[PDB]
């Protein structure tokens, strides 16, 4: 069989992390990415797996993810280095029969282990799975520059932040009509911040971590990266506007509503109501 | 036998200088990089060494560095060109038995010499070796754009500056808990500034040269580049924030303290006190 | 004999124009580059020359440039494409024995011609040849973004502007101690702007064209590009500083003097007595 | 971004050709090497590819190789020089959608073309792909000195030759249990010899060209070089033995059979029968 | 602490295998090397060990080697590749408290395991330890070219072979006065061939495996390599002599005896008696 | 302008003489090498030339070599040292306008002179220039080991020897279809041997000096070295074959003819009608 | 003051022993080298000398060597290791005021002593000093492979052996016209062999020790190594010839006489009247 590093998902992971690194969203080891795969995706590469896969317990039972394989970025790993050493920076893990832990089937060579925001990722995956009926398969976290900067000047309010981002680029309301969830600052790499994020994932495909980064969910690598890139693009436009003195004009609520009606999507009411 | 140009350290140097260039931190020949190697690293390449190495007396003798080899960037060399002609822009030097000078074993072709800031590097290498018990092996200087810009608007005070950078990105306190040392502006290339920088290196892994650049130390090329990139990323976020009118909210002291405990690290007290 | 496209000068031209494009200094067909070569440089490529070199009369004869060959960028050509087809975008021309005109020995295919500014370039090359005793060999014009932006906010005075750029990065005084000449806005492409620029070139290696771009001169492609890149980097830093409210501190007048002293260079006096 | 000259496959090619050169198996431009890559291998280096790849019609269409990339040695190129200028001596080619020809994406500078024996390589690649179910990726030809010398004193018979080589070193039967195919002398570079070699490749991983050289196939550069080196080592031992008067004792058939069972491998029956 | 790859023993292993590869004694994965270390040698590098060392049972109990650490070459590994990837090709193993098996403390990355002639090495180590009172610490196997060739024309007799080798170079009797043991051909990588070799190791520091290679033991890496190199050198001289028609004259028994007396060593009686 | 030592011709000279030394063809001061350059080659290195070029009168004037520059090996110089000090062992000479003598423009330090055979070389360069219409630029003499050995066992006849070498490696007829000229043994260093060699050069690119060495001519350093290396490789194969008892089979007379036909070359007729 | 490790003589010693190791002439610790220096040579490094030089009483006083300094190889040292640690393998010794003993001024660390044969060397140095009017300064002993092999097949007679070696390569008669002295086999390290060798040194610059090695003397390291290399090259050619059945043709007695006359040297008469 073909080498697993040449698979669609491994190549996709390389592409997403590499593009993110070039965007300037992932300095050092900042950010992480997890993709939910199907048994059939990895079945072809059984001969590539470690002969004695490492098992690592899971922070809290996640029955819904039992026997579910994921390709993930490693803890403390650089998005910049993914492209040339995939196995060292990426790993394929599989939650066991009862979601108690997982085995590292491939990659994460040299005692490496999955990302430290993993308990956060799995929790959000579970919620996005129910919220989107199994359609969302990607959870991506990165340090989107402008989005971060905005968390220091905009009221950390979901409705307020969502509305500004919708205003920052015409298609934002269409790309993320459910809005963006904003959590209060919280210590990272914790079951706690993972819980809260997962809770926001029930209501939004996008979640902001003030003074830190963004969390996005989507059906595919491109759609997810695209989701984040759209919000960051709006944020980038907003940063320039604010820096110039603020909005002289912008998209009106009636207009935002008309936009929603046209693309047959229903905008977060609270944000829409401003 | 493989050419030394294909060794891990030559490739590493190419990578670091190339990335910093693409970042826009090294216009013209600004910046420099020195990496401490082990004789075992260069032993395979005896055949690539200059038959009669050019000797270069070291201003201040550095016995601590005796018989130690380094790969360094050249004087008057462009980071942008390193990838194009490694031997012309890089050089491997070895400090003699009593650290009175060094021989250029490889590179630095057409009578080129090491970075003029080399002695300053050596001083800091010595202080970092003692401070980290020989773990640190890299000294990197570059003109990180936003970090530079901030030295014109923030109080050139170690505690204040460190506190703002910690605030600029959640990860900063964990990446550089020892904070950032800020020297007063000084004529570059002098023994004075090298002395003062080395002084600061005793307390910090990061040192700022107002209206000029940054100085970083770390165990590997990636960790040091990563260290600088993290600080520069925070600085970039701060520049946007300040440009928008300043912080409305930020990470709290108590939060910064919690962060410190969560990652088993002790934050520069003076910076926390703020 | 390798193809001329592989020659150091054709490759250097590609590198410079490409780097400039990647910098954002050469949108559309903005900018141009001319490099003075020696006959020995192009001698080995007689096989690559055009059988019937085309001839073009020089409006104003350049006697001091008699029999002098140059590699130049074409008129209407995009810096971005130079790398996609060197011969189509670049051309090697040789002024005849009496400086009456030149022959297009290579490149400039499809009947393309040198930059319509070749005559202005020639005028400055002359002034620089005299000013540097034949060391300067390059004239480069590009639309350096931040330098342009600053011409809308800073006094368009050689002394004031020079002072700011020196302050924007420690190395600037050392790189261009003669300062930067600032002409008043003028219609591009006129013998007047060419004459005025040439006049400024007698005193400065860098000349600014308000609301338009920069003009630089130097001994090699890297040095000239490096010169411009250094000024643009300082400008970039200044734009951020001004955007944040202005300098809280900067390099003192006395410090700049010390810097000059140390590197054995004499700074434009006017810039230090504002 | 790292230059493709530093990729694992370019370095691998440099290593193999350099080692064979040092072995004395590749005088002048004798010998050639082709390695089948995956699009994922060259995908990171899009920026190093020729803007408008030169297309080269393939004599015999090879649909099995459609859209497949290879790194190959050039025609008229010296193995000894590969390490000195990779781009000049090596080239990356990609077979078009229907295997009618290929485009040269990188290398083979100054209008150089792939080894003239390329079509022969492609034929064998096809037979080895089928024979090993896509495991083999390398086809290497060189003038192994002792193997050549033996073709003048040993009966040019597959069974006989294989038996002697197995006897020349204990490890041989385990390294090449399928034996060595011996073709009759044939004019090189012909479609005839490429056809016959490919034929033999269906049964053996090693093929001898009397009074000329050896042809080997394997999964990786090292395994193929290693395969050839093993046969050549045995041949070298045999040359010394014959030169001393011949074998007094040797490995027995029954012993060769035991060896075969011990390592779970089935020896070419005809060779064992002897 | 210092990285283990920079230790004396790791560097020694690299040197021995590399020199052996250059000698032409180790094609492909031919040959193996094991060195007995002391706890104190590796104690300094505890932090380099795998966090979960792999355990592998031992073919047969070896109590005498309980808690004994060794640095060994991996199975199927190339001597040629040791120099640039030590951890992948070398491994540090430690026999457990009762010599039942060992843990792979360092190296042998990527599911690699110790050499296949390991049960042979340990058995010979045990015998050489008692035979030399713990002074011998190295066991080296390689495919010494001429020694191999001679096993096909010389009577595979210890006394006979030993005598010819003594005759092949004056100092051979002084280097290996105990002679060379010659086993009958035997299937390799077996407990059997390991037993027989160990038995010969009781009487000799050198053991020949007809049509395969040599096995040597000594106090250090250099002394052992030197031992083998001396025998191979004599063998090389013998091959040329035989090829020229045989000995016209040689060292006499009286002379060999006098030689033994002078260097105060007692020559194998049987071999001496011829 | 880089130093001349880095020029392609000085580097080529180092490469050729070093490779030859590593081959065992140039013990002590055996052998010499001269390369005909073009003025454009050395023109760019006017700075590296000797202020007062030394002049040496040519016993016999070479009018056809007027104003022709060559890089040559020095008299009494060791090929092995060329790499340790190019200027000391190599020299660039230029014959004057009337071919009366030459000026030592570079190298040949400490009053060293060109090979005492420069005049013989010049004589052959002349004959080769005429024979190849100015393409051949190199004359190389070395002590090719096997070629020398064969002159003691094969008939020293151009046709017989040529036939054997063609047979020793398939490519030989194609590389040197004009065959190899064999002179009778003669005292080296005499105008007689130079005259006779030059005479053979009119017909062959390769000339043998029985019990001494080989003389080769070609367009570039690599081609000439390659030419010699090819003949020596065939010779090497022949030595082994003869040592084993002679050819049992070989390339037939008809096959050699076919080979010639295929590569569009006409083989020395005498060599095919023995 | 420069370091002695980079002195011409220390580097020369490294180069000679290293080249000899690469030649395969110095397996294990076989061979030795001593070079006679002038005080002017080592004087500049007095600062590197052992503060309290170790004295060594010499077997028998050698007034001719009074106050004479030598750089020598150590006892039991490997030629292969000299390049790795010069000070450990080499030593500079100076003969006292009355040739009674010497002081180890430099090197020979960790209690190492000069080659066990220093006195035999000294003995020959004396004879060569007288024989060549103080021109010879080097005594070198190594195990030249082919020369050794020939001592088993050629009559160990000075005249007969000398004639064959002269015949093996045209320049041998010119290089060593006084021929090669052949001693009968003798126990190495005895006063007798040293005496006998010295006696032969009065008449020859080259002495053979049957079934052991060669002994050479010359003015410089290169000339001496070159002398031995020339003889070994001839021997190498002879071994091939004899292996092919013997000389069919060779250099005639008359031709050898003409060669001698031509280069103004008088060949050992006995060798030319067999
Ligand atoms: Zn994060
Ligand atoms: Zn700087
Ligand atoms: Zn413009
Ligand atoms: Zn071939
Ligand atoms: Zn083996
Ligand atoms: Zn010669
Ligand atoms: Zn000896």
SS3 state at A33: strand
* Ligand index nearest the alpha carbon of residue E27: 5
> Which of F201, F199, F230 is closest to F215 using CA atoms?
F201
User: Residue ranges of the alpha helices (H) in chain F?
Assistant: 8-23, 39-42, 86-89, 118-131, 145-150, 158-167, 172-175, 191-201, 221-243, 253-262
Q: G218: distance to nearest CA of chain F, Å?
A: 13
d(CA A254, CA G138): 101
d(CA D199, CA B175): 61
Spell out which chain A residues touch chain E, with contact meaning CB-CB distance below 8 angstroms. Answer: 50-52, 54, 109-111
Question: In whole angstroms, how far apart are CA B264 and each of B174, D76, D204, F251, F260?
Answer: 9, 62, 60, 77, 78
D vs F, Cβ pairs < 8 A, gives: 84
Strand ranges inside B52-200, DSSP E: 54-57, 69-73, 90-95, 101-107, 138-142, 180-182
> Up-side HSE of residue E248: CA atoms within 13 Å toward CB?
13
The structure tokens 């010899």 sit at D193
C-alpha B225 to ligand 1 mean position (Å):
18
> Which of E232, E213, E216 is closest to E224 using CA atoms?
E216
Axis crossing angle, helix G221-243 with helix G8-23, rounded to the nearest 10:
10
C111 in catalytic set: no
d(CA F14, CA F12): 5
d(CA F190, CA F199): 14
Tell me the CA end-to-end span of chain E in Å, nearest whole number: 57
Over its C-alpha atoms, chain F yields an Rg (Å, rounded) of 19
Q: F254: distance to nearest CA of chain G, Å?
A: 27
Q: C190: distance to nearest CA of chain B, Å?
A: 31
User: Residue ranges of the alpha helices (H) in A206-264?
Assistant: 221-243, 253-262
* Cβ-contact F148, F236 below 8 angstroms: no
> Which of A152, A160, A150, A155 is closest to A232 using CA atoms?
A150
Best residue of E83, E86, E88, E90 to probe chain B, by most B CBs closer than 10 Å? E83
How many C-beta atoms surround the C-beta of residue A111 within 10 A? 9
Q: Give the annotated binding-site residues of D.
A: 141, 143, 212
Q: Token pair of D241, please?
A: 């033995």
Q: D130: distance to nearest CA of chain A, Å?
A: 13
Best residue of F22, F24, F25, F27 to probe chain G, by most G CBs closer than 10 Å? F27
Chain B CB contacts of G11 below 8 Å: 52
* Cβ-contact E59, E191 below 8 angstroms: yes
Q: Token pair of G61, please?
A: 């006083």
Phi, psi of E80 (to 5 degrees): -60, -30
> Which of F182, F226, F19, F29 is closest to F113 using CA atoms?
F29
SS3 state at E86: helix
Chain G neighbors (3+ CB pairs < 8 Å): B, E, F
Give the rounded distance of the alpha carbon of E76 from its chain centre: 17
Catalytic hit among G117, G127, G200, G232: G117
* Cβ-contact G69, G114 below 8 angstroms: no
Angle at alpha carbon of residue E154, lines to E149 and E156, rounded to 5°:
100
User: Residue ranges of the alpha helices (H) in A132-220?
Assistant: 145-150, 158-167, 172-175, 191-203
Chain F CB contacts of C41 below 8 Å: 44
Chain A neighbors (3+ CB pairs < 8 Å): B, D, E
User: Residue ranges of the alpha helices (H) in B24-107?
Assistant: 39-42, 79-82, 86-89
Instruction: Specify burial of residue C229 (Cβ count, 10 A radius: 0-12, 13-18, 19+).
Output: buried
Catalytic hit among A27, A111, A117, A232: A117
C-alpha G170 to ligand 6 mean position (Å):
8
C-alpha G146 to ligand 7 mean position (Å):
14
F64: DSSP letter: G
Q: Token pair of F192, please?
A: 């007689």
d(CA C81, CA C87): 11
> Which of A59, A79, A72 is closest to A115 using CA atoms?
A72
Catalytic hit among E117, E167, E200, E232: E117
Protein residues within 5 Å, CB atom, of ion ligand 1: A 213
F54: DSSP letter: E
The structure tokens 């690649």 sit at D125
Chain B nearest-CA residue for G2:
B55
Sheet holding A213-218, edge to edge: A54-57, A101-107, A90-95, A69-73, A32-36, A138-142, A213-218, A206-209, A180-182
**Residue F67 Rama label (left phi>0; alpha psi -120 to 50; beta):** left
Tell me the CA end-to-end span of chain D in Å, nearest whole number: 57
C-alpha D189 to ligand 4 mean position (Å):
9
C-alpha C117 to ligand 3 mean position (Å):
10
Range of the domain at C268: 1-274
Chain E neighbors (3+ CB pairs < 8 Å): A, B, D, G
How many C-beta atoms surround the C-beta of residue D187 within 10 A? 15
C-alpha A31 to ligand 1 mean position (Å):
5
Q: What helix, strand, coil percent values describe chain E, rounded to 5?
A: 45, 15, 40
Q: Token pair of G144, please?
A: 């030249």
Give the rounded distance of the alpha carbon of D57 from its chain centre: 23
> Which of C34, E28, E234, F184 is closest to D216 using CA atoms?
E28
d(CA G176, CA G256): 13
Is beta strand C206-209 parallel, antiparallel or unpaired with respect to C180-182? parallel
Q: How many domains does chain B have?
A: 1
Over its C-alpha atoms, chain B yields an Rg (Å, rounded) of 19
> Which of D213, D259, D191 is closest to D32 using CA atoms?
D213
How many C-beta atoms surround the C-beta of residue A235 within 10 A? 27
Protein residues within 5 Å, CB atom, of ion ligand 4: D 30, 213
Cα dihedral A78/A80/A83/A87 (nearest 10): -10
Question: In whole angstroms, how far apart are CA B13 and each of B7, B32, B89, E191?
Answer: 10, 11, 10, 49
Tell me how long chain A is.
274
Catalytic hit among B27, B117, B167, B171: B117
Question: In whole angstroms, how far apart are CA F105 and each of B183, D50, F43, F54, F113?
Answer: 55, 41, 11, 7, 12
Cα dihedral C241/C244/C246/C247 (nearest 10): -60
Phi, psi of G191 (to 5 degrees): -65, -35
Q: Token pair of F245, please?
A: 């008892």
SS3 state at B103: strand
Ligand-binding annotation for C50, yes or no, is: no
Chain D nearest-CA residue for F249:
D152
Q: Which residues does residue E102 pair with via DSSP β-bridges, in sequence order?
A: E56, E95
C-alpha B134 to ligand 2 mean position (Å):
25
The structure tokens 């109990």 sit at E61
* Cβ-contact B69, B25 below 8 angstroms: no
d(CA A81, CA A18): 8
Best residue of C8, C14, C240 to probe chain B, by most B CBs closer than 10 Å? C240
Contact A27 B233 (CB under 8 A): yes
d(CA F105, CA F41): 13
Catalytic hit among D117, D127, D167, D223: D117
d(CA A9, CA F227): 52
Contact F211 G251 (CB under 8 A): yes
Ligand-binding annotation for E121, yes or no, is: no
What is the CATH number for F138? 3.40.225.10
């Amino acid at each position: 069989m073909q080498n697993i590093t040449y698979s669609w998902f491994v190549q996709g992971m390389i592409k997403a992390t590499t593009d993110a690194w070039l965007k300037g969203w992932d300095e050092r080891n900042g950010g992480n990415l997890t993709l939910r795969l199907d048994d059939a995706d990895i079945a072809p590469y059984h001969d590539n797996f470690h002969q004695q896969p490492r098992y690592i317990p899971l922070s809290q039972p996640m029955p819904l993810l039992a026997n579910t394989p994921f390709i993930v970025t490693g803890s403390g790993k650089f998005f910049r280095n993914v492209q040339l050493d995939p196995a060292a920076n990426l790993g394929i893990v599989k939650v066991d029969s009862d979601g108690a832990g997982y085995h590292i089937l491939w990659g994460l060579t040299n005692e490496a282990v999955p990302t430290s925001e993993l308990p956060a990722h799995f929790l959000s995956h579970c919620e996005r799975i129910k919220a989107t009926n199994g359609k969302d398969r990607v959870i991506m976290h990165c340090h989107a520059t402008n989005l971060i900067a905005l968390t220091y000047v905009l009221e950390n309010d979901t409705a307020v932040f969502t509305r500004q981002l919708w205003e920052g680029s015409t298609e934002c309301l269409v790309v993320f009509p459910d809005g963006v969830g904003i959590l209060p600052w919280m210590v990272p790499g914790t079951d706690a911040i993972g819980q809260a994020t997962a809770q926001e994932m029930q209501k939004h495909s996008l979640v902001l971590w003030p003074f830190h980064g963004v969390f996005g969910s989507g059906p595919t690598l491109d759609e997810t990266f695209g989701l984040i890139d759209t919000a960051e693009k709006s944020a980038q436009v907003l940063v320039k506007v604010y820096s110039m003195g603020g909005m002289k004009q912008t998209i009106s609520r009636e207009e935002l509503i008309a936009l929603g009606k046209r693309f047959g999507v229903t905008p977060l009411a609270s944000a829409l109501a401003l």
